[PDB]
Design a protein around this ligand. Structure first.
Ligand SMILES: */C=C\S(=O)(=O)N1CCN(Cc2ccc(OC(F)(F)F)c(F)c2)[C@@H](COCc2c[nH]nn2)C1
Ligand SMILES: C=CS(=O)(=O)N1CCN(Cc2ccc(OC(F)(F)F)c(F)c2)[C@@H](COCc2c[nH]nn2)C1
Ligand code: NA
Ligand code: NA
Lengths: 306, 301
């Protein structure tokens, strides 16, 4: 049993490539559901989804990331585990194929006070000393027991200054994962996506997880997005971004609400239950007559598991 | 032209030998901050002046004299936040630079306003390229006479840390936070943290304190945050805190720590004497499982 939601980016519409994003989201979901169905951890299954999305040449992450001011690729990534609340993250990482891998390994290292956030050359050498190959996308996962994990990985802004680290590397901002707890009736997972130099100035992922502790998830996430992306930005333009989201609870059955929302003119997502094994994709668009920056698209389904 | 400042030079084990040194940097840091507020400067410029002085002390784990990493190099984290704009600058794993807080303050000003965080060599190249002098946890909070707030934090991190390891003093929400009054905040709040270790980052401590301090009783808000969110998921560290609101301007300040002890300094623009204090846990409380908290109030125009 298990479930996985992924996204391959929230930005400008590209019918040109819109069907390439659908294909990679599919393979990312399948990779994650195999991992789960083989009994691997949630953080492992989420890392599988992300390796696959990063490897797409069309995703601003891993291979294909935007080049910085120096015509180089510098990556950010982060992952977080719901059961342990442990976290792994890399910033400004160069010459590593799959950043999310460094971030995951940093997390498993921490689960055995180890480092949890490494950047630049420090991050690069650590990564090689731990056996990881040389030379924005996101996933959230729940396993058949209610354990959630989340992850995110970006190439950041095009022509960004060298060493410039953005939301995907930062605790609470790029992704978040938090199992049912005394104050969380729901296990929740969030992965976000930012766009343009204009970016939310909150702990977005963490905010969305707290918001999703209300009773009506759909309304709960829609109000967050309205506040953080549109509303809060006195004299600034709308914030371009996406977010994916899932919350779960036990009632021997797992209830899993799942959602995506975005102010960009579109965003391609991908989901799949282990029970059915049917991998669904869907390119979400903004409704016409709605310009990006002040409209919020939002969509979701639910899913019962064993 | 007026205001108030609160700084700290560390939260750690007690040292009677070093104790008087720590008291004197806090004293100088407040004096550097308050002079800039008499001279019309902005809050961010005042809190940076405080941090440059704390940094320079050889005895603080920040700036010159920071702990050495696993390769015996110095790699510094620092950040700064302005409460009126909510702008934010930060450096991590920064080397070759004398005052890391100066870089982080620069990244704000050069703005125009979009948040910004540079690490490692690229942070060095940015800094050298923008005039900051290349070199051979402390923090500060401040409010000015109109109630604008700002905060900063600079640290050299955990001794022998892996290179590129970045800690709480670089991380948005964790090391410092500053926010003027609005529709969410009846209060202008400013927070800076101390300590190292991961439990600062894992708890978004600075921003959480600011959020708690919108409640009515500041002492209770802080004490709730230190117990219910620090000591509960040993946890070592501290914060300084200040909060203003109009009556003319009332500013409540407090510090708190789970470490053995913590050196602070405060000062008003009206009053010319910098007060200084070593805050120690009571006999027979073990550090990391216990909390101390004190503070005062101050009235401005
Ligand atoms: C990772 C821990 S730390 O960086 O925050 N740390 C604790 C603070 N020390 C400075 C300090 C210690 C104690 C007090 O209170 C007291 F009154 F007792 F003095 C302070 F105000 C300040 C840091 C010192 O350790 C490293 C160092 C010392 N000199 N240069 N670097 C460490
Ligand atoms: C901080 C930068 S970004 O994350 O905001 N960003 C936005 C997202 N696109 C990818 C993307 C676009 C549209 C999508 O949906 C659809 F509806 F199909 F159009 C979608 F799913 C993914 C990134 C493109 O980057 C250029 C590139 C190409 N190859 N490699 N890089 C950049
Ligand atoms: Na890619
Ligand atoms: Na120092």
């Amino acid at each position: 049993g298990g479930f996985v939601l992924v996204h391959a980016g929230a930005g400008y519409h590209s019918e040109s490539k819109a069907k390439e994003y659908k294909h990679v989201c599919k393979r990312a979901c399948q990779k994650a559901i195999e991992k789960l169905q083989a009994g691997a951890l949630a953080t492992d299954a989420v890392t599988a989804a992300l390796v696959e999305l990063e490897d797409s040449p069309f995703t601003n992450a891993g291979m294909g990331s935007n080049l910085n001011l120096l015509g180089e690729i510098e990556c950010d990534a982060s992952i977080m585990d719901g059961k342990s609340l442990n976290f792994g993250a890399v910033g400004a990482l160069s010459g590593i194929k799959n950043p999310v891998s460094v971030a995951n390994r940093l997390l498993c290292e921490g689960q055995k006070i180890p480092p949890c956030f490494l950047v630049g050359e420090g991050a690069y050498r650590w990564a090689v000393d731990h056996g990881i190959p040389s030379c924005t996308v996101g996933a959230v996962v729940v396993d058949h027991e209610g354990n959630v994990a989340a992850a995110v990985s970006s190439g950041g802004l095009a022509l960004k200054h060298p060493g410039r680290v953005g939301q995907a590397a930062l605790y609470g901002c790029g992704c978040w994962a938090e199992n049912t707890g005394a104050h969380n009736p729901y296990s929740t997972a969030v992965s976000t996506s930012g766009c343009g130099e204009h970016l939310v100035r909150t702990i977005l992922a963490r905010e969305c997880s707290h918001a999703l502790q209300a009773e009506d998830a759909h309304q709960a996430l829609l109000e967050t997005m309205q506040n953080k992306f549109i509303s809060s930005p006195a004299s600034e333009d709308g914030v371009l971004g996406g977010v994916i989201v899932l919350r779960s609870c036990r009632c021997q059955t797992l209830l899993v609400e799942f959602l995506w929302s975005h102010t960009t003119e579109s965003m391609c997502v991908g989901y799949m239950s282990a029970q059915d094994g049917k991998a669904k994709t869907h390119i979400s668009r903004l409704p016409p007559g709605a310009v990006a920056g002040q409209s919020v698209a939002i969509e979701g389904g639910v899913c019962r598991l064993e």
